[PDB]
């Protein structure tokens, strides 16, 4: 509140770490517009998240140390948003990239679990290799990395230094071509991925590029590759979503394609309207996952979309949490993110856009319906199907206490956050016909094609298990060969040659 | 090496002596008592001296006439400069 009166952001000069030749790096913090709003949010969710784990992990003898592992994560992810000293951004950049390993790797054995770690730290390290390039470029040219100074003394050619950044963006923002890591990043504990994927760790990839707005506004090369990238991420995730059988997996891709809209908004120059999205969005998918807890646990487990049943069997409240949020993510009719996804395709959509993303993105908006309605209709709709002796109890003070806070802090949220801002830009506000509800226009028939096809999937005339189709769809088919290849063409070729084959000869 | 003795290094006694002779000599007298030394140890590489003297001397020139950061080659016409 102190800021939303007088402005007056701050930093701090504190403590001099070593001072080499000329550039003197000490440390600092940044109170800026991304600092004032977000940080309360990232703590507010995590306020509600641990209670859930407090019930979920309740029986684990090592629980005491769990909250330690989960604690540093929040700490050091919290110093990424606040640091104006470019080096200092890199302390927590990799401080979090290790935390993934020490969480996804929770369960030993489970030959998949600890090989989902070695993924996370393989793909981030490539995505590392960029952001150390733009860490070098500023010295040899500008003789500082201070985020203040670059913005005061503007670089002419950002072409090389910036493209490095767009590469480190894609590492942690789960963009296309680095994507195969998320769907297998879910193999750990449930409240983990709730924390990993909601407001944290996936946001830095498209976060960092925002911080660079003042310098990036020029040089169409920059803007060009962005929206020539993020838009494409969507339909390889969407086209890979359908047919997938797990509660957790579909909720993984749902946040995978939430990205494509964010990164597009950096492509057209929309610095703030991109970031407002995450502030709003993060309230969803923590709930949405944390909802599925009582579904997985109290069913003793399945986390398959098969063997689910219908909407009401002793799940009155949690099933209201789904159909609120899982409605909200659908294009926000009056709800929370009504200022997030809705103010994009109606604003930046008047621009130089590639005339493909317009085709491409708005089509992805459709599947936002069938994302939802699928995992709604197999879990909340059909007849009960699952083995007998099901003990379900939802009366859980240490749970119901958690959901109730979010959904309340959900509906009111989108309007409170949005209503109070100093306006930073000019939206067009003159929106002709047929450009108007063109998102809503698509979702309207999404629900149509949701239910008509749902009944056409199950309730239909018995379209047989006809063996012939093309599924490159449910696999994605990229995770099939490459992960059979990259650990061949390298490990067994440039080593077994280089090994005692040569050095001993 | 456990006949249900506790033990650290070798045998009955000085083993017990051998633990206090490492722990106590090893740290709390060095990793602490010593670490204190260089913590506030005096100005290292004469930089402390430099901040102020590279502070005072800025304005002295800036005050009257003089430029800032000359690099005039240390008073030419002290040098005959062989041409060819």
């Amino acid at each position: 509140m102190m800021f939303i009166h007088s402005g007056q952001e701050l930093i701090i000069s504190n403590w001099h770490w070593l001072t080499i030749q000329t550039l003197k790096l000490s440390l600092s913090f940044k109170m800026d517009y991304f600092s004032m709003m977000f940080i309360p949010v990232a703590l507010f969710v995590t306020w509600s998240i641990m209670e859930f784990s407090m019930w979920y992990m309740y029986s684990d003898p090592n629980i005491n140390k769990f909250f330690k592992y989960l604690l540093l994560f929040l700490i050091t992810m919290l110093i990424l948003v606040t640091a104006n000293n470019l080096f200092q951004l890199f302390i927590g950049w990799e401080g979090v990239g290790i935390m993934s390993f020490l969480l996804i790797g929770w369960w030993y054995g489970r030959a998949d679990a600890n090989t989902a770690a070695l993924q996370a730290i393989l793909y981030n390290r490539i995505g590392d290799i960029g952001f150390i390039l733009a860490m070098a470029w500023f010295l040899t040219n500008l003789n500082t990395w201070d985020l203040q100074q670059i913005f005061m003394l503007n670089p002419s050619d950002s072409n090389m230094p910036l493209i490095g950044l767009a590469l480190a963006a894609t590492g942690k923002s789960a963009q296309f071509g680095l994507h195969p890591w998320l769907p297998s990043a879910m193999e750990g504990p449930t409240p983990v991925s709730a924390l990993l994927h909601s407001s944290t760790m996936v946001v830095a990839g498209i976060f960092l590029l925002i911080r660079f707005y003042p310098l990036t506004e020029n040089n169409k090369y920059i803007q060009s590759i962005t929206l020539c990238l993020g838009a494409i991420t969507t339909l390889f995730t969407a086209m890979c979503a359908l047919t997938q059988n797990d509660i957790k997996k579909i909720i993984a891709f749902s946040t995978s394609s939430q990205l494509g809209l964010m990164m597009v908004t950096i492509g057209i120059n929309q610095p703030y309207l991109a970031f407002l999205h995450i502030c709003t969005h993060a309230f969803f998918k923590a709930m949405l996952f944390m909802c599925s807890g009582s579904i997985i646990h109290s069913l003793n487990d399945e986390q398959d979309i098969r063997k689910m049943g219908g909407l009401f069997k002793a799940m009155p409240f949690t099933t209201t949490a789904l159909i609120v949020g899982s409605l909200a993510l659908t294009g926000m009719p009056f709800l929370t993110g009504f200022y997030s996804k809705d103010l994009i395709i109606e604003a930046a959509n008047t621009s130089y856009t590639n005339a493909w993303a317009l085709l491409m993105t708005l089509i992805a908006t459709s599947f936002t319906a069938i994302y939802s309605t699928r995992i709604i209709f197999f879990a909340l709709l059909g007849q009960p199907r699952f083995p007998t002796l099901v003990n379900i109890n939802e009366n859980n003070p240490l749970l119901i206490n958690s959901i109730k806070r979010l959904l309340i802090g959900s509906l009111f949220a989108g309007y409170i956050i949005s209503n109070n801002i100093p306006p930073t830009t000019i939206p067009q506000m003159t929106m002709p016909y047929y450009l108007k509800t063109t998102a809503l226009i698509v979702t309207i028939l999404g629900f149509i094609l949701a239910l008509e096809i749902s009944n056409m999937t199950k309730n239909l005339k018995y379209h047989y298990p006809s063996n012939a189709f093309k599924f490159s769809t449910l696999l994605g088919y990229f995770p099939t060969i490459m992960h059979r290849l990259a650990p061949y063409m390298n490990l067994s070729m440039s080593q077994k040659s280089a090994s005692s084959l040569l050095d001993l000869i | 090496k456990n006949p249900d003795s506790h033990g650290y290094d070798k045998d009955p006694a000085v083993d017990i002596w051998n633990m206090r002779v490492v722990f106590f000599f090893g740290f709390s007298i060095v990793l602490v008592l010593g670490s204190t030394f260089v913590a506030y140890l005096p100005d290292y590489r004469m930089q402390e001296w430099a901040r102020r003297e590279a502070e005072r001397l800025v304005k002295y020139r800036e005050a009257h006439g003089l430029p800032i950061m000359e690099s005039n080659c240390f008073d030419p016409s002290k040098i005959q400069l062989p041409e060819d």
Partner: protein, 114 residues
Amino acid sequence: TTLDPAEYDISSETRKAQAERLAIRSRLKREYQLQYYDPSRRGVIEDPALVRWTYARSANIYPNFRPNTKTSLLGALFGIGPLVFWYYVFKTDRDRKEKLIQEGKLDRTFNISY
């Protein structure tokens, strides 16, 4: 792509005289469990296939080697080759970049570092 991998082939009935391909292995898993079940052991097992796995791999080549076949003189295409290349790439730079540093000034005057 990599590979068929031949999950069906010809068979039936030829090479049904081939038996005791299991007698080879069945002997050991009898003997191995005859090894592996004993009250007093407390220790690892010889497992020769591992002894002959490294020692026939790391050592026992330069002994076996002969410098003859020109597919073993191949390595000049591998070992030295690109090491010349990286000289060809660099030595052009560090020069092309040098010539300009003399005639003409590419940099700015706020670069002190270096």
